[PDB]
Symmetry: D2
Subunit: 251 residues, 4 copies
Amino acid sequence: SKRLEGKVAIITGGASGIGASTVQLFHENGAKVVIADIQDDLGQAIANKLGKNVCYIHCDVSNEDDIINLVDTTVAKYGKLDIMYNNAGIIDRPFGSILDTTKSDLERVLGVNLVGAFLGAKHAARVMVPQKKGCILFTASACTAIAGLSTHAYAVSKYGIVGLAKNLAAELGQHGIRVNCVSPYGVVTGIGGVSEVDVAVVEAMLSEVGNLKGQILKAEGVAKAALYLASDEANYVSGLNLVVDGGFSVV
Amino acid sequence: SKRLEGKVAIITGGASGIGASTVQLFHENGAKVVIADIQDDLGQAIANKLGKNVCYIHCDVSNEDDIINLVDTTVAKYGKLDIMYNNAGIIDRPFGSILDTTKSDLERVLGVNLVGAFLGAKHAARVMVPQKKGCILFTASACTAIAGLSTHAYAVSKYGIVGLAKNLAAELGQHGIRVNCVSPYGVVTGIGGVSEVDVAVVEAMLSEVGNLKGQILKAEGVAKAALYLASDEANYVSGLNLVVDGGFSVV
Amino acid sequence: SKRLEGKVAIITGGASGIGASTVQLFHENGAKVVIADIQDDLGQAIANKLGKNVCYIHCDVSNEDDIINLVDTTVAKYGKLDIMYNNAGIIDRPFGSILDTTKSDLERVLGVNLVGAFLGAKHAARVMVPQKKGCILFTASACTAIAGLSTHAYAVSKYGIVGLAKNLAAELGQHGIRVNCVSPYGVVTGIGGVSEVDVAVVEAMLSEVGNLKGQILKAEGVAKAALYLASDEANYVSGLNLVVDGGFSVV
Amino acid sequence: SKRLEGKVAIITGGASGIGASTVQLFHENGAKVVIADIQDDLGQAIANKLGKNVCYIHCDVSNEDDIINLVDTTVAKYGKLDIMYNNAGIIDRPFGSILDTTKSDLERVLGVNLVGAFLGAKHAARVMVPQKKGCILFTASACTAIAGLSTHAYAVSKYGIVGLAKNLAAELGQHGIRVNCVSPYGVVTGIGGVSEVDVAVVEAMLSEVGNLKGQILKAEGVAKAALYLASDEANYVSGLNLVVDGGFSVV
């Protein structure tokens, strides 16, 4: 039942959505968990609820000094880093045309989703390579065309993440490090927005075709995929994009 | 610890290799397990060792009457079928050129690997559709070019299996059934041969670059992938080819 | 305008559909063309119409003696073989469930589509390897789940073909030979049937949502993809599945 | 011989490498060609050499005002835009580890390669949607892990481009617009650098394992792929990544 006993995990975007489900599940499975987010109230509350083996650290993943602080503090606190789950993600104006995407919105989505994932992976690898041990995860997407149910900026950021994961699996495998993605189809509750209006549009679309229990189950399904990949039962699993979408994307 | 409690699984090729590791692991995790193979001595011995919730049934998967007998007997014995793991596989002359593959060898490999998988899936789906519940698994391969480390016939059969799994995920998802592949890179110990010489060539290549403990770990890694996908912690995972190869295939 | 001047091409299924469009286009572009089919009346008529640099040879591609006769006669007639286009394909009962596919129908579709493609590639490679020159083509499909618009047997055969092409590109590249697929989305006019009823069902579905001019344009689009890949303007293009579907399969 | 007669093409990065080969080939095939680059001396010289149906426009593709100027001027000059080939690309320090990639270098590569491609596609689509006609191309890469022969930043940018192309094919297909990538394996002569040292390292690696005639042939092969996809002989080809690598990436 303690499939992560003694492991040390960092989870970005850990204050809500998939990140929060994974925080809880990893904690229930024996890991030490560092919640990284920018929603301090939500994140600190979860840390306080779960107790001593969970702590919250403010981290804007697009800011490399925050990422360094997050990794270095985790290692200083626990001596190691077993799992780096680069999950934080935001979206610009959902269901907009390519014709109407602004450069500013594109660069904000890429900065948090793609650059932030890149920086988290860079500094986690900095620690994991001397350990010759580690698991770097990303939240990505299905590899069909998901922009129609998200945005072009969002879809591009997640495609770039899949390419990052593949290339890091190739570089870091020789050092005993696994690199994988876990991926809902596209947008899931708890995603952030370039603007609050963006969050509001996302909220509307999710409840228009979904139970609350159902969004929670999609998030928990992704979390349980992260649990499998981060555990020793996936010691030989690297370079995978583990899509959790009920098969929606194959047809 | 009992991630499959009460579930009923059929595992073809279950008398050796990946199949046998999965039989054992599923049994340790609470499933009722039906071992299907043609190696009666090995298969019956495993059933006898593991006890009452395991039984052995002779089944040439290329023979549709055997497949029907296997599925119908399992359902008659346990009332349901939760998991159908079409894992049996054989290979022709390893590392041969396309120029020297015989039609007979190609048709034998396709018959056991591809047709046998198709027939097992057909009759498992026959039972699972009324249940609106089920998980159909296949042992496939990486989707890079693996013939150089197996054969063209073998690689073709496993590519056809990946396409079968994708299309069945699309048809059966509406009936609550998941369809996935779990896949070592290519050849793994316990694979059968069109001839015994073929098994002998396979044996030589595996020990030329591998510990016994290492082949056992590759097989156990695939088994643990099957365990995850067959459990309720993968309720929303369908259409995936879960490759277990340490990232070997991405470079 | 003569993008294939002096090249020698074999085209299976060349008496109808995509095959016939490609016969004509290759002939207009300067190639010597061998039409291989089992529809002797149609095939001989096309040869007679196009003139001396076109000839018709009866060939059941599932029969290896026919394939040998086809390749050997072409080489005896022209001294070389530049292009082998394994295009012949048939389908079983369209839009049927996995539950109702017969073994016999599956084995007939695999025999013509998959084994026939394998045998054509084997004996073309036999000739092309000493030339250190050649282009082997297959008609495949999109790599999304196309069974819903074809059959499971058909989709599996075309997935196996994509895997064959990838593995042959890897083996034969060192000998200067390119291997590619050209692929309509799924079913196209001129496909054969396990039964005539199967052809009749196919005919109905195509005209239910399509102009005659439109099926002709889809076939000509595939033919022009084959023309590009077979020409020297694709000297460095190998291992590709060139899908011609207007982008239908990405969404 | 005039496979692009009357068509109007914009080619970014058109002053060197693949871009320049494509400028020349498109011009020889009857297109009006707008060379977009930042290497004014090289670009203006090519325009002057080729004559009246070729012109050069300074354009930093990461700058959206430059992109607007480039598209609007082309349309003002010729009344339409048939082909937008977003080919410009740069690289940071080749063969470096993830551990040593700077944020600044990553953001520069993404800005030119990914954002620049996005902006070019946005403003080309702005013109092409009212035409209900157009072809948007990108220079991408193979979809295996190419960072070991380029950089992680470079590989990520090209993976993001493949995802952009797939999603735009899905959005723009309903308006009669095709979207495709043409792709050398990875780095090719004529690529720009974040620094000149980066160009120097690239130059060294290419000539260490390659003839000058050979880099020219790889570039011309990509150009001829762009010619096919941009011509009416690919009217029904959209969502493809046409990789031109001799099959190097499948093994």
